[PDB]
């Protein structure tokens, strides 16, 4: 079973699954605590349990592994990562790690990982021999990122005006200088929808602050 599969489930499932596994009062506490309790209960049975997420390196190799759907929130369900396998696999911050996870021992309250079977959606040996980002030589934008959806949507006029106004391509560095109450949120929403529709290959990330 997948920890990510648990985290993608809604909150009410704690009644359906947590109570069915013998837990007593998972109704009243924070969701990550419910996830921790259910996955501890399942781990006590002994079946193999999967895990995955984005790696974080602390100031002293006290590595952690967070989940994307939880907005990388520091919670009990975070996966511990000792410096030993960090050195062995030459890992660093931002690495997507997937594989086995281990139930915590005495004195530990975080689920460590037994062995990784996927790094950055690739084999660990293929991920190890990859050069650093900053060593890559930049260039100007070459491939055009057309925002015209082409589905004839009633809101597609925004994307069309965007295409006529400012061309967007791979590798640009863009700014949207707007006042409050101007339409930034749904302009970015239309941009994201057009990117998801026209260009399913490129990885799309949206980041929201305060």
């Amino acid at each position: 079973m997948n920890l990510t599969e648990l985290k993608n489930t809604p909150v009410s499932e704690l009644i359906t699954l947590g109570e069915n596994m013998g837990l007593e009062n998972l109704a009243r506490m924070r969701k990550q605590d419910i996830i921790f309790a259910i996955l501890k209960q399942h781990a006590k049975s002994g079946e193999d349990i999967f895990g995955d997420g984005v790696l974080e390196i602390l100031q002293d190799g006290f590595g952690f592994l967070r989940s994307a759907d939880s907005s990388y929130l520091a919670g009990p369900d975070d996966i511990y990562v000792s410096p030993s396998q960090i050195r062995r696999f030459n890992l660093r911050t931002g690495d997507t790690i997937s594989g086995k996870i281990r139930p915590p021992k005495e004195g530990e309250r975080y689920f460590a990982l037994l062995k990784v079977n996927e790094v950055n959606f690739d084999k660990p040996e293929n991920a190890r021999n990859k050069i650093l980002f900053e060593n890559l030589t930049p260039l100007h934008a070459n491939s055009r990122l057309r925002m015209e959806r082409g589905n004839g949507s009633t809101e597609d006029l925004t994307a069309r005006v965007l295409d006529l106004a400012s061309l967007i391509g791979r590798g640009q560095r863009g700014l949207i200088v707007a006042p409050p109450k101007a339409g930034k949120t749904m302009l970015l929403q239309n941009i994201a929808q057009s990117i998801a529709y026209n260009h399913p290959d490129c990885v799309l990330m949206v980041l929201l602050i305060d």
Partner: protein
């Protein structure tokens, strides 16, 4: 041996232009095939279009170079044939042009130029009269093969491809895009 150099330079230019037209046609055909497909492939189609104009510009450049080299080799052969025909029959020629071509060694610039102009247009009436009576002009025997493989005129598929009149700005923009395309193809 300069005529042979011009000849095989023109042959190389023609081969290069044919090759350029080859990948241009291939790119156009595959772009049409992808457009006919059900998949969207927006970036695929956009960069394929860009490749299409890059290949079109390369074809234009190759055709222009081929036409220029063909004209150059024709001019070189004309100069050589007319020069040694001078070396053959120039005594009789200048005898026919005697009443105004004398004194050229010491005449003034204006007099020399006007005498040359009179000689030129007189040759014009003579030549147009010979073309008017109308025999079939035959190629020079010494260079007949070299001047007949290149053809009387450059191929029409090259002439119709040299009417775009690209501006210099577009010229170096397309050169930069072609260099970037070659670099991407190498990778």
């Amino acid at each position: 041996t300069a005529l042979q150099q011009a000849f095989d330079t023109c042959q190389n230019n023609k081969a290069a232009w044919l090759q350029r037209k080859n990948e241009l046609a291939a790119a156009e055909q595959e772009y049409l095939r992808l457009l006919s497909g059900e998949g969207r492939n927006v970036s695929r189609l956009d960069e394929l279009r860009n490749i299409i104009e890059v290949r079109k510009w390369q074809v234009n450049q190759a055709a222009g170079r081929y036409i220029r080299s063909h004209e150059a080799v024709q001019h070189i052969s004309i100069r050589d044939r007319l020069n040694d025909f001078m070396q053959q029959h120039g005594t009789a020629l200048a005898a026919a042009l005697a009443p105004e071509l004398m004194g050229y060694s010491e005449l003034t610039a204006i007099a020399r130029n006007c005498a040359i102009q009179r000689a030129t247009d007189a040759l014009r009436e003579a030549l147009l009269s010979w073309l008017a009576k109308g025999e079939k002009i035959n190629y020079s025997a010494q260079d007949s093969d070299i001047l007949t493989t290149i053809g009387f005129r450059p191929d029409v598929a090259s002439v119709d491809d040299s009417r775009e009149k690209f501006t210099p700005a577009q010229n170096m923009i397309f050169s930069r895009k072609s260099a970037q395309l070659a670099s991407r193809q190498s990778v």
